[PDB]
Amino acid sequence: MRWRADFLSAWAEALLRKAGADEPSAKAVAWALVEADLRGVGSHGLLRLPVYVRRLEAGLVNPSPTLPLEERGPVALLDGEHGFGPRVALKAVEAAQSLARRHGLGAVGVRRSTHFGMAGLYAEKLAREGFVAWVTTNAEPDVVPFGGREKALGTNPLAFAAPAPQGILVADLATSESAMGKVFLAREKGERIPPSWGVDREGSPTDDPHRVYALRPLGGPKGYALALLVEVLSGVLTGAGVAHGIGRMYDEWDRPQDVGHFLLALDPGRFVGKEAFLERMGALWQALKATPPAPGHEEVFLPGELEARRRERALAEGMALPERVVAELKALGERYGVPWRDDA
Amino acid sequence: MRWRADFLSAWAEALLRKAGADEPSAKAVAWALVEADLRGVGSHGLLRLPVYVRRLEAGLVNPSPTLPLEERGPVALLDGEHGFGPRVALKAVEAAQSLARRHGLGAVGVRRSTHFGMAGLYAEKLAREGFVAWVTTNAEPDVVPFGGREKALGTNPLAFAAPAPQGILVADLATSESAMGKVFLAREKGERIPPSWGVDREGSPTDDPHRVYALRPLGGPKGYALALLVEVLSGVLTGAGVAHGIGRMYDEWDRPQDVGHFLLALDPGRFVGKEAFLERMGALWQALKATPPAPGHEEVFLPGELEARRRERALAEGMALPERVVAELKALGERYGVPWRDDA
Numbered sequence A, B: 001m002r003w004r005a006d007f008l009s010a011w012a013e014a015l016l017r018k019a020g021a022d023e024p025s026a027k028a029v030a031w032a033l034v035e036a037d038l039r040g041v042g043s044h045g046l047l048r049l050p051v052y053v054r055r056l057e058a059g060l061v062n063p064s065p066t067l068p069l070e071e072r073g074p075v076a077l078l079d080g081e082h083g084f085g086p087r088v089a090l091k092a093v094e095a096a097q098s099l100a101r102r103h104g105l106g107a108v109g110v111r112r113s114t115h116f117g118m119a120g121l122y123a124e125k126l127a128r129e130g131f132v133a134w135v136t137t138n139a140e141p142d143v144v145p146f147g148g149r150e151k152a153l154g155t156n157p158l159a160f161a162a163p164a165p166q167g168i169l170v171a172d173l174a175t176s177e178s179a180m181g182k183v184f185l186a187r188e189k190g191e192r193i194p195p196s197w198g199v200d201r202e203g204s205p206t207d208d209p210h211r212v213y214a215l216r217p218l219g220g221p222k223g224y225a226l227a228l229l230v231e232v233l234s235g236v237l238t239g240a241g242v243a244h245g246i247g248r249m250y251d252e253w254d255r256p257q258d259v260g261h262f263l264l265a266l267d268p269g270r271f272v273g274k275e276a277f278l279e280r281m282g283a284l285w286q287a288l289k290a291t292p293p294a295p296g297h298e299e300v301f302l303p304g305e306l307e308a309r310r311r312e313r314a315l316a317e318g319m320a321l322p323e324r325v326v327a328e329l330k331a332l333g334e335r336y337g338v339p340w341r342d343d344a
């Protein structure tokens, strides 16, 4: 069962306004979640709308932040004022590209934000402006450090993007084996998960998403190191919450999260040159596509390539949603007087 | 059998001078390789000296580069002129910290360099100057892309570092399951390797380092995406060799490599603040050390922590080297009239 993305986008925005979010915030969230679904990244799509709205309802999210920005040369600090992550992140994107246009590069350290959805969306937006982009965000601890048995770091994802003649190369990855959102998606779809993703409360691997207590770092020490890099850039460096100091969106309803983000935009025009960069990216892209596939693969794909293909398809045939997610969205619609669209 | 690091360092430098390297280049290489050995990273230690010298002998390395540097605000491009990687990289480090001191951040794109050893060494040096550091380098293809069966990308490692009250957090990781240097080390030590690291020429996993044809990306798609990020920053963006365009240090003796590197230094003083940054890093460090260990672990360690401990120990008790490496170094010493030190 597929749904009209444009209708769901309008619906989500309306529900958010009804819940109290101002116009730019409601649009930013509707955009971030639906865009994720379009690309086939359900872990960061409308599946998240219910908890996002509940956080607002509980008074843990700023519905209309001013978003103070302080510039210092090619560096800028953004105060999210506890606004919705997508709203905060989109302003960070604008600030980063503006700084890069003027100085050749721009770094934005964000504090007091909240879960911002798919990191790749922001990196992609920056790349569409002609910049090489690097975007990171920390999160409440859900992952054991390498060699440890208790949660110490968030899934702390990182995203990177760069323009190419063939399209936008976009990488989006949690530094743990898997993002927690994928565990949530499995729960909604009623599916088992790879047992290497996490362990139960007794430290044993489990393929039951409902029994996952903590996640494991990607490839042991390496994913652990990457999680720390993301933590330093997104949290320590910005003035935002750091690891255990970050409020848990799903478990702590006493105060705002204070999630931090880090965004860096680089102008290739200041390096090898804009035209040269694109031609070189094109040759790299071409080379990867020309690589003979491994068994079980029809061809090699660039990060973001399949996502772009899925988006086009979903915009034409509609986007899919798990029955359980729809049921929750319907209940949410009734709670806020913005009924699920029967024409969607 | 352990050896005096100071004696080996002096020996290597002398052999390099004898082979034709100028003073700064010989010192840079001796430094990079021995420092790697001290930290227990033999994959990037003196094990590499023989091939480095052979590259110089064959006329594929500039023994005394001028190292032209072009600054453009917080960005700078460095022409390695085919000099030894460590020599080129050390100048990049100096340029990066200088730019960061003036602008708050500094990015250096390096082209026409060669294998530079352990990336973590450069990130660490930058962090000791008070900066958050990010260092990457591309390399000739040795890794299959996710979904592919032929080599398309180098092990393309990335390193990150940041100062803390307890020490310097330093992450150093190849984006493939393992670095090729670890495969070489296993060969010298006469040990088997994890079969998940690479495949033989027929595409089958092998635990025999002598039969490894291609390596696999870290955790499939994620390591592949990370390798591309490193390739874009180190190669595409800099004007250096890109993937298949990079000369193979071990297999192609017709022309220089043209390896590229990317270095970024961030001044925390321009973000949350220098003092605040250190205190926050200290709390994060403390939290990780306080995490209960998993079975088989005595405690949780920070990236770079064990490496620092090993360095101190090696400086006091001497550094170890595989018998096969020593034998090759001895043959090298005789070839260049700089005999292996019997007092080492």
Ligand code: NA
Binding pocket: A057, A058
């Ligand atoms: Na209420």
Ligand code: NA
Binding pocket: none
């Ligand atoms: Na009310």
Ligand code: NA
Binding pocket: A171, A172, A173
């Ligand atoms: Na992804």
Ligand code: NA
Binding pocket: B057, B058
């Ligand atoms: Na010769």
Ligand code: NA
Binding pocket: none
């Ligand atoms: Na000669």
Ligand code: NA
Binding pocket: B171, B172, B173
């Ligand atoms: Na390492």
